[PDB]
Structure 1
């Protein structure tokens, strides 16, 4: 009573019902480094300008 698969069937992506748990960390990665802080705030003008030796703007 076995039926041979048609052209296209054995390459289908099928879904599998399992009882084992999903691997939560399969790469065994350690804790990632904390990122650098983002920039926040409103952008104020430069305090007394460029501060390049005598340039007052």
Structure 2
């Protein structure tokens, strides 16, 4: 009864109904580092300006 596959059928991506659970951490990854805290708040002008030496602005 064996029909021979046509051109392109054997190259298809198919799906398989497996019973195996999906691996959780296939890379055996460490915990990722905590990120640097983000920037919050509204911009206020520099207190007393640049404060570079004798400059007042």
TM-score where L is the length of structure 2: 0.97
Q: Please give the alpha-carbon distance, in whole angstroms, between the structure 1 residues aligned to 2:40 and 2:11.
A: 51
Where structure 2 has 5 or more consecutive residues not aligned to the other structure, the ranges are none
Shift of residue 42 of structure 1? 0.2
Where structure 1 has 5 or more consecutive residues not aligned to the other structure, the ranges are none
Q: Deviations over 1:20-46 (max 9, x none)?
A: 100000000010000000111000000
Q: Deviations over 1:1-23 (max 9, x none)?
A: 00100001011000010001000
Q: Please give the alpha-carbon distance, in whole angstroms, between the structure 2 residues aligned to 1:20 and 1:10.
A: 24
Give the alignment's Cα RMSD to 1 decimal.
0.4
Runs of at least 4 residues off by over 2 Å: none
